[PDB]
Design a protein around this nucleic acid. Structure first.
Ligand SMILES: [Mg+2]
Ligand SMILES: [Mg+2]
Ligand SMILES: [Mg+2]
Ligand SMILES: [Mg+2]
Ligand SMILES: [Mg+2]
Ligand SMILES: [Mg+2]
Ligand SMILES: [Mg+2]
Ligand SMILES: [Mg+2]
Ligand SMILES: [Mg+2]
Ligand SMILES: [Mg+2]
Ligand SMILES: [Mg+2]
Ligand SMILES: [Mg+2]
Ligand SMILES: [Mg+2]
Ligand SMILES: [Mg+2]
Ligand SMILES: [Mg+2]
Ligand code: NA
Ligand code: NA
Ligand code: NA
Lengths: 144, 214, 210, 203, 98
RNA sequence: AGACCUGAGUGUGGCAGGACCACCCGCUAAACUUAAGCAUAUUACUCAGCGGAGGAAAAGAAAACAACCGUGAUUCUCUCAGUCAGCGGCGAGCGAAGAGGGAUUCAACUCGUUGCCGAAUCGGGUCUUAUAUGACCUCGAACUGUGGCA
RNA sequence: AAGAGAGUAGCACUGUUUGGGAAUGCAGUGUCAAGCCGGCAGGUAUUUGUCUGCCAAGGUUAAAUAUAGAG
């Protein structure tokens, strides 16, 4: 809304908050990111230290669909099951089966304390996730 | 986009004892040597000409829109808030008002008017009738010549029993599916006189749900 | 004074704005609700003209490519020549009774082929096939008063007869096998991954060994 | 058939017998006009491949074009502005000489419809093409279902808009897929698509 | 059915085993078959017209015994090296026949 | 003297030019400006100049994507994506594609060539209520190949 | 039983164009193919061997799209 702007407060002040000595002029320091190495060096070095220069190898025709790999931790496995199933199964009983591809996940990382045993189907798995799920009474079935 | 800028004006420069504004070329027209192209000049271009890609419309979160409708419906159930908005409900009984389903079968406007008098909703209709007047200002030149107030609502289970209740000035018709917040809270103020048919009243539990019931 | 801000990169220096000297390069959407109404009117009009033919022709079920969409199914352009032969329908005659035909699809596995063959067989058993001449009926066609019972399909996807897409059912709870509670699956998977990753280096080592 | 022998014989252009025939023909063409009408095509098998059909309404012309690069038409060979835009002799035209021959014939004779063309001869100064044309007012053309599409008004001067085989070549339309993404409908059509500013109603 | 797949990602046969129908014979495979009629027609024409100046230079180089120099000459004239090796085999065989 | 080839004159029946030009197709083609200077870069494959259509134009039926459990002519839309793709005094700046959800979609055909035929084709005249995809005639065109079947 | 478009595609130099980077598309001149283990594409140059997808150099074609100083 125009009625909330500072322009409404400045009607009658003749300068609009820009001063009498150094006025409001057009581009007193250049346009855009000009002079980033000459008269704006301190600002660039202080806040954007990695702006100038190159780093690493190149990759033509990236095709981001080939590197799709979402991850989920062992601590969040309960959110993929029904509420009753979390407390229904333990150790030697029949365990729920979780398929990670249907829910949109690829790799199973093992972080935190596992709540309930289960059978998880995944494309990739971790060293720690494999050991923790096996001790708790579950298993991992590899997918494709 | 070309308004005010269809001349070949240019500045006379300095040394001619005139201001440095661009001036129109030519001679023999009384427009020659006149100021041009500036927002301060007569017949010039205005400051910051308006465009059509201004942001005209707005997005609102779906949950917030459903919250607003639910709040306005509850406000219509309190007689104190209904009277405070401006409705005359002195002769009504048992707000919120629910009437039988034989109303949908009316065919003549005379029958509809008798029903409004029986349940006491005619006072709000008369309030709208007496308030009709010619609008003040330039708006009367732009296809909105008369102004009137907002009367009762009548909510129906569908778009079936409408023919008798149309043409009655000051009565609004609504469908229980697709309730409109702009109609439930005219001007942003909550609490509107609403008359419910029995069939539409029984559908409110399904449409909006309860607590602990989706 | 500038402070701690991001570097902008706004990309707007190419005379896109209409002014007194530039035509501009813009696109607005003020006709969006009007075009929605028009398209709906044409769909209803087409349905009235072609009655009782279905709105959309039959299409096959296919698998999406790449690893991101491996598990997803959608509708394809048309049926395969191998599939049509399996269901005993000629391709040029198939296009006549509302079946889309694709002459480029390959049918690289039997699971995809069997699903699409079942789609054609169900569609064939549901067709009524009004006779070309009502006085003289030839071949197995619609009988009298079977024509009067026909009804147009407006499913927006052509699923009146075949239905939805076929996806394997979710597995049921079971017990962990004794070998499943012992085998190290990361060791199993890493060994296979290393076999391909270090194929060239291992061959070079053996060649040098000779 | 007989086509096979004529076709393979024309792939031995650098042979003693073929070079003799072309040398005599090139001398003969050098003493004729820029545009000449022929009773029958010089290469009958090449003409039938690109549309000629030896019926009433089909005509063949031989057109001559000059060789070399384009010279910029600036006064005294002087350019102005940035040095990047300099040079009057070293730049080339963005149209090929096959399409220049088709456009020179169509512009001169406005009552014909240009169909196609093919290569015939060349020397150090000139290059020769033969252009197949059709007229649209003849009864034999108008009643033939395989050619009467050209009677329609949308095909007027199709060679001036780069719609022929030679025109499609310099427009990049021989390519497909990732080799022609930036010019597939047209070069200007793709530029409009990628540079217009879009304002959704509820952006 | 060629090479049934394993059930897992990675490991020389990446996973999701299916039944893997073999292939369709198609009609573009005739492009890889010999063309007897095309070969015979070219034999007649090459008889009629004789030899080109490029082939005369190659034949005179092969007579001396400069096979490497012949290939370098053909590669410059013809472009790719696959085409150059084909041309040298053709001129050499014609010399052997005659 | 008579053919064929190449080329003229006249007569009969037709067509082209000019206008419009918002959008569309083909060529030609700047500088102001930004880089706090400026020459590569940018503005911009834009403005100005020339030519050509329509009710839309152009494109369009794989010498295409991908690397998967595989998609399947063209066009357009959201998104991919101001991109941890890429180009660049690597500075200022610039900058797409495959996939995915959709709009539309009974969408597809055929010349040349190969094989079997070889005027069965075209023009003109006459007849059938008819400048018939019909019939008859035709030292008219066409075998230096029009048409028909796979 | 056969066949499927040659100064064409490719290569060298020069110029322009592109995000296309030991060269994305195109133009001029020189040179100029294969089809008996064929040709083109597979985003880092060269030689050699596999695998995958297509089969250029002739033509027509509605609908969904534009109307940024027209009728
Ligand atoms: Mg003060
Ligand atoms: Mg201030
Ligand atoms: Mg200051
Ligand atoms: Mg004004
Ligand atoms: Mg300061
Ligand atoms: Mg102006
Ligand atoms: Mg004109
Ligand atoms: Mg017009
Ligand atoms: Mg400057
Ligand atoms: Mg400055
Ligand atoms: Mg300066
Ligand atoms: Mg068209
Ligand atoms: Mg650019
Ligand atoms: Mg023929
Ligand atoms: Mg076309
Ligand atoms: Na007033
Ligand atoms: Na212009
Ligand atoms: Na060439």
């Amino acid at each position: 809304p125009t009625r909330f702007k500072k322009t409404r407060h400045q009607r009658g002040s003749t300068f609009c908050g820009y001063g009498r000595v150094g006025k409001h002029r057009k581009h007193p320091s250049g346009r855009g990111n000009a002079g980033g190495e000459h008269h704006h060096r301190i600002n660039f070095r202080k806040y954007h230290p990695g702006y100038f220069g190159k780093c690493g190898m190149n990759h033509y025709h990236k095709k981001k669909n080939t590197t799709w790999k979402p991850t989920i931790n062992l601590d969040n496995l309960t959110k993929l099951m029904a509420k009753d199933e979390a407390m229904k199964a333990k150790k030697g009983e029949a365990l729920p089966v979780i398929d990670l591809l249907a829910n949109g996940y690829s790799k199973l990382l093992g972080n935190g304390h596992l709540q309930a045993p289960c059978i998880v189907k995944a494309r990739w798995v971790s060293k720690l996730a494999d050991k923790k799920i096996r001790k708790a009474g579950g298993a991992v079935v590899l997918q494709a | 986009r070309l308004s005010g800028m269809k001349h070949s004006a240019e500045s006379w420069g300095t040394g001619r004892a005139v201001a440095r504004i661009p001036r129109i070329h030519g001679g023999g027209t009384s427009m020659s040597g006149a100021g041009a192209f500036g927002n301060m000049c007569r017949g010039g271009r205005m400051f910051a000409p308006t465009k059509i890609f201004r942001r005209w419309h707005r997005k609102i979160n779906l949950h917030q829109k459903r919250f607003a409708v639910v709040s306005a419906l509850a406000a219509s159930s309190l007689p104190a808030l209904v009277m405070s908005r401006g409705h005359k409900i002195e002769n009504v009984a048992e707000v919120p008002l629910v009437v039988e389903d034989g109303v949908r079968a009316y065919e003549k406007t005379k029958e509809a008017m008798t029903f409004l008098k029986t349940v006491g909703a005619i006072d709000d209709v008369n309030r709208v009738n007496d308030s009709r007047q010619i609008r003040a200002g330039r708006g009367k030149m732009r296809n909105r010549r008369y102004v009137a107030r907002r009367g009762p609502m009548l909510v129906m289970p569908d778009n079936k029993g409408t023919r008798a209740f149309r043409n009655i000035f000051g009565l609004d018709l609504a469908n229980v599916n697709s309730l409109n917040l702009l109609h439930l809270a005219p001007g942003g103020h909550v609490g509107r006189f609403i008359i419910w048919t029995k069939s539409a009243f029984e559908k409110l539990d399904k449409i909006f749900g309860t607590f602990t019931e989706p | 004074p500038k402070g701690n801000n991001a570097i902008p990169h706004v990309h707007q220096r190419k005379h896109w704005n209409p002014c007194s000297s530039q035509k501009g390069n813009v696109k607005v959407f003020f006709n969006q609700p009007a075009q929605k109404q028009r398209r709906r009117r044409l769909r209803l009009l087409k349905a009235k003209k072609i009655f009782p033919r279905p709105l959309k022709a039959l299409r096959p079920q296919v698998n999406c490519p790449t690893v991101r969409y491996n598990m997803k199914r959608r509708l394809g352009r048309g049926f395969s020549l191998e599939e049509l032969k399996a269901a005993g329908v000629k391709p040029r005659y198939a296009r006549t009774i509302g079946i889309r035909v694709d002459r480029r699809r390959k049918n690289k596995s039997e699971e995809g082929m069997n699903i699409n063959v079942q789609r054609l067989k169900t569609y064939m058993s549901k067709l009524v096939l009004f006779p070309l001449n009502r006085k003289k009926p030839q071949k197995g066609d619609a009988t009298e008063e079977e024509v009067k019972a026909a009804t147009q399909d407006r499913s927006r996807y052509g699923t009146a007869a075949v239905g939805g897409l076929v996806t394997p059912a979710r597995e049921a709870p079971r017990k962990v096998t004794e070998e499943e509670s012992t085998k190290k699956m990361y060791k199993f998977l890493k060994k296979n991954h290393s076999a391909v990753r270090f194929f060239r280096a291992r061959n070079r080592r053996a060649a040098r060994k000779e | 058939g007989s086509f096979m022998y004529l076709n393979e014989l024309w792939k031995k252009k650098s042979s003693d017998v073929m070079r003799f025939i072309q040398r005599v023909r090139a001398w003969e063409f050098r003493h004729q006009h820029t545009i000449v009408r022929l009773r029958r095509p010089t290469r009958p098998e090449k003409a039938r491949m690109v549309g000629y059909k030896t019926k009433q309404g089909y005509v063949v012309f031989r057109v001559r074009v000059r060789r070399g690069g384009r010279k910029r038409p600036v006064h005294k060979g002087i350019t102005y502005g940035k040095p990047n835009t300099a040079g009057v002799l070293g730049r080339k035209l963005n149209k090929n000489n096959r399409v220049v021959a088709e456009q020179r014939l169509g512009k001169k004779y406005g009552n014909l419809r240009v169909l196609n063309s093919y290569w015939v001869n060349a020397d150090s100064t000139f290059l020769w093409y033969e252009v197949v044309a059709v007229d649209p007012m003849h009864r034999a053309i108008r009643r033939d279902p395989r050619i009467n599409w050209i009677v329609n008004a949308v095909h007027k001067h199709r060679e001036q808009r780069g719609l022929t085989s030679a025109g499609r070549k310099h427009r990049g339309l021989r390519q497909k897929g990732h080799k022609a993404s930036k010019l597939r409908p047209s070069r200007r059509a793709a530029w409009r698509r990628n540079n217009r500013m879009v304002f959704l109603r509820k952006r | 059915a060629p090479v049934p797949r394993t059930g897992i990602i990675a490991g020389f046969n990446k996973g999701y085993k299916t039944t893997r129908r073999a292939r369709r014979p198609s009609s573009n495979d005739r492009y890889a078959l010999p063309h007897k009629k095309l070969r015979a027609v070219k034999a007649i024409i090459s008889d009629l017209v004789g030899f080109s100046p490029m082939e005369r230079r190659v034949q005179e180089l092969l007579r001396v015994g400069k096979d490497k120099r012949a290939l370098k000459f053909c590669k410059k004239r013809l472009g790719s090296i696959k085409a150059a090796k084909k041309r040298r085999a053709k001129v050499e065989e014609a010399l052997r026949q005659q």
